[PDB]
Amino acid sequence: EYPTVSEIPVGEVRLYQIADGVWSHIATQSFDGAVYPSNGLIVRDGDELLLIDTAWGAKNTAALLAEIEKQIGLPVTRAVSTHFHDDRVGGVDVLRAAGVATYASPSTRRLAEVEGNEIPTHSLEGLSSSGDAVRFGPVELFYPGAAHSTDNLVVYVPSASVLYGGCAIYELSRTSAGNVADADLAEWPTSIERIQQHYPEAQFVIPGHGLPGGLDLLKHTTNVVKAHTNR
Ligand SMILES: [Cl-]
Numbered sequence: 121e122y123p124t125v126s127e128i129p130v131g132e133v134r135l136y137q138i139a140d141g142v143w144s145h146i147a148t149q150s151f152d153g154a155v156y157p158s159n160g161l162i163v164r165d166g167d168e169l170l171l172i173d174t175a176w177g178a179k180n181t182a183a184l185l186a187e188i189e190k191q192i193g194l195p196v197t198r199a200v201s202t203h204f205h206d207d208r209v210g211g212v213d214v215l216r217a218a219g220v221a222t223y224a225s226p227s228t229r230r231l232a233e234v235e236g237n238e239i240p241t242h243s244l245e246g247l248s249s250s251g252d253a254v255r256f257g258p259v260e261l262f263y264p265g266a267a268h269s270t271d272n273l274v275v276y277v278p279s280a281s282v283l284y285g286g287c288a289i290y291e292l293s294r295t296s297a298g299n300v301a302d303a304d305l306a307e308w309p310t311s312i313e314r315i316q317q318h319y320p321e322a323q324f325v326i327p328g329h330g331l332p333g334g335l336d337l338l339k340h341t342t343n344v345v346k347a348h349t350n351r
Pocket residue numbers: 220221222241
């Protein structure tokens with residue numbers, strides 16, 4: 121039932137329930153002359169919701185908020201962006217206008233400002249060194265080291281054993297690298313090793329784009345990154 125790129129018109133947002141109190145959000149966007157899906161996460165936080173990542177653009181993110189109200193009916197009170205690119209922060213202004221408290225690490229906020237992307241309001245402390253983890257409501261935020269970007273965070277939901285990798289983890293159907301312009305290709309395998317060592321109990325793994333899977337997505341991503349490094 122997990123929605124794919126061909127089953128989501130650009131501008132629409134679909135939700136998928138992964139576990140009790142954990143959903144992914146799926147949207148699509150035109151980029152480089154193709155259409156790509158993108159995932160984020162929604163995690164129940166008592167009687168509120170924590171959002172992980174925008175829906176890749178202002179229009180998509182407004183649709184995301186509407187779909188959350190229609191399907192779930194709890195308020196989104198906080199959001200975390202897992203790196204500085206537009207598929208993670210594009211729509212932060214919509215969230216802020218809607219009363220959501222937006223968060224990112226200091227490194228993400230700075231990179232967003234340099235790039236000209238939207239800047240989350242609040243800073244997340246305790247994530248400046250590889251291997252750092254902090255609890256943030258019902259999730260753990262982990263900085264594995266540089267990978268897809270130098271600032272990329274991953275998110276673990278302890279109660280549901282859900283690991284959200286963002287753009288640092290590839291879906292299985294992606295067998296060649298994605299956007300690596302800002303990547304640290306040399307460190308990416310080591311950063312994945314840190315994720316594996318820190319979250320070996322994860323049951324569901326959600327990539328930044330495409331279908332969820334298990335922990336096999338981690339080794340798959342290393343294989344693809346290494347192949348790109350050698351090409
Ligand atoms: Cl705020």
